[PDB]
Enzyme design. Structure first.
Site, PDB file in Angstrom:
ATOM      1  N   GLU A  35     -65.187  27.497 123.820  1.00  0.00           N
ATOM      2  CA  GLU A  35     -64.924  28.490 122.786  1.00  0.00           C
ATOM      3  C   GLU A  35     -65.886  29.665 122.833  1.00  0.00           C
ATOM      4  O   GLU A  35     -65.426  30.832 122.832  1.00  0.00           O
ATOM      5  CB  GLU A  35     -64.929  27.892 121.368  1.00  0.00           C
ATOM      6  CG  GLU A  35     -63.709  26.989 121.132  1.00  0.00           C
ATOM      7  CD  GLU A  35     -62.393  27.686 121.068  1.00  0.00           C
ATOM      8  OE1 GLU A  35     -62.331  28.899 121.133  1.00  0.00           O
ATOM      9  OE2 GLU A  35     -61.384  26.944 120.977  1.00  0.00           O
ATOM     10  N   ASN A  46     -58.171  38.941 117.305  1.00  0.00           N
ATOM     11  CA  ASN A  46     -56.827  38.613 117.820  1.00  0.00           C
ATOM     12  C   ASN A  46     -55.943  39.786 117.361  1.00  0.00           C
ATOM     13  O   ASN A  46     -55.481  39.816 116.201  1.00  0.00           O
ATOM     14  CB  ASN A  46     -56.369  37.239 117.347  1.00  0.00           C
ATOM     15  CG  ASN A  46     -57.408  36.162 117.705  1.00  0.00           C
ATOM     16  OD1 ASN A  46     -57.720  36.031 118.919  1.00  0.00           O
ATOM     17  ND2 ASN A  46     -58.020  35.415 116.798  1.00  0.00           N
ATOM     18  N   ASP A  49     -52.422  39.096 115.706  1.00  0.00           N
ATOM     19  CA  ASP A  49     -52.119  38.706 114.304  1.00  0.00           C
ATOM     20  C   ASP A  49     -53.179  39.205 113.335  1.00  0.00           C
ATOM     21  O   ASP A  49     -53.135  38.781 112.169  1.00  0.00           O
ATOM     22  CB  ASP A  49     -51.932  37.195 114.197  1.00  0.00           C
ATOM     23  CG  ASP A  49     -53.278  36.487 114.351  1.00  0.00           C
ATOM     24  OD1 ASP A  49     -54.343  37.010 114.622  1.00  0.00           O
ATOM     25  OD2 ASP A  49     -53.247  35.255 114.186  1.00  0.00           O
ATOM     26  N   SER A  51     -56.318  38.406 113.019  1.00  0.00           N
ATOM     27  CA  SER A  51     -57.353  37.439 112.542  1.00  0.00           C
ATOM     28  C   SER A  51     -58.500  37.607 113.563  1.00  0.00           C
ATOM     29  O   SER A  51     -58.332  38.269 114.621  1.00  0.00           O
ATOM     30  CB  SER A  51     -56.809  36.029 112.535  1.00  0.00           C
ATOM     31  OG  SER A  51     -56.479  35.639 113.902  1.00  0.00           O
ATOM     32  N   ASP A  53     -61.851  35.177 115.278  1.00  0.00           N
ATOM     33  CA  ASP A  53     -62.511  33.884 115.562  1.00  0.00           C
ATOM     34  C   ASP A  53     -64.042  34.159 115.514  1.00  0.00           C
ATOM     35  O   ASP A  53     -64.548  35.077 116.153  1.00  0.00           O
ATOM     36  CB  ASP A  53     -62.092  33.254 116.872  1.00  0.00           C
ATOM     37  CG  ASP A  53     -60.564  33.119 116.977  1.00  0.00           C
ATOM     38  OD1 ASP A  53     -59.902  32.622 116.064  1.00  0.00           O
ATOM     39  OD2 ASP A  53     -60.083  33.515 118.045  1.00  0.00           O
ATOM     40  N   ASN A  60     -61.241  30.407 112.989  1.00  0.00           N
ATOM     41  CA  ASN A  60     -60.366  31.524 112.597  1.00  0.00           C
ATOM     42  C   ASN A  60     -60.351  31.875 111.131  1.00  0.00           C
ATOM     43  O   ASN A  60     -60.238  31.040 110.227  1.00  0.00           O
ATOM     44  CB  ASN A  60     -58.982  31.244 113.200  1.00  0.00           C
ATOM     45  CG  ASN A  60     -58.026  32.432 113.173  1.00  0.00           C
ATOM     46  OD1 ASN A  60     -57.249  32.429 112.202  1.00  0.00           O
ATOM     47  ND2 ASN A  60     -58.119  33.291 114.198  1.00  0.00           N
TER      48      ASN A  60
END
Ligand SMILES: [Cl-]
Ligand SMILES: [Cl-]
Length: 134
Positions: A35, A46, A49, A51, A53, A60
């Site tokens: 990750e 992202n 959409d 969002s 991380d 998220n």
């Protein structure tokens, strides 16, 4: 902060992650590795959409923390960890660990992260904790 492999393993162990909701320490290590490369300040937007991380576990903002700029979760919980997403960027990982524990409390467990399925599931993940003394 960029953790060294064994330093993280020992930290996670102390934080009670080994066997948390049936997930071995090596799995959590594999996840942090893929990750963020063990980096607590990593962030990934992202575009798709809207969002983001955040942190070592790349948690998220759609469901787990509040960053105020993510388009909601209609009505469901959009801040299940009860944290500002900022909290997931600290060098001290106590908050990120407590949030990662909350994530796995949902039915998907560790499967919540696609990276875990791609790079850790059904693999020999012992490599991540070998010789760390945990
Ligand atoms: Cl907070
Ligand atoms: Cl907040």
């Amino acid at each position: 902060k960029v953790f060294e492999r064994c330093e993280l393993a020992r930290t996670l162990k102390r934080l009670g992650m080994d066997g948390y909701r049936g997930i071995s320490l090596a799995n959590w290590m594999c996840l942090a590795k893929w990750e963020s490369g063990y980096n607590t300040r990593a962030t990934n937007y992202n575009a798709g959409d809207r969002s983001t991380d955040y942190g070592i576990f790349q948690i998220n903002s759609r469901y787990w923390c509040n960053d105020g700029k993510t388009p909601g979760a209609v009505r469901g919980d959009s801040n299940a960890c009860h944290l500002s997403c900022s909290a997931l960027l600290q060098d001290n990982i106590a908050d990120a660990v407590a949030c990662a524990k909350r994530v796995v409390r949902d039915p998907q467990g560790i499967r919540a992260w696609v990276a875990w399925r791609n790079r850790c599931q059904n693999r020999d993940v012992r490599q991540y904790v070998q010789g760390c003394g945990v």
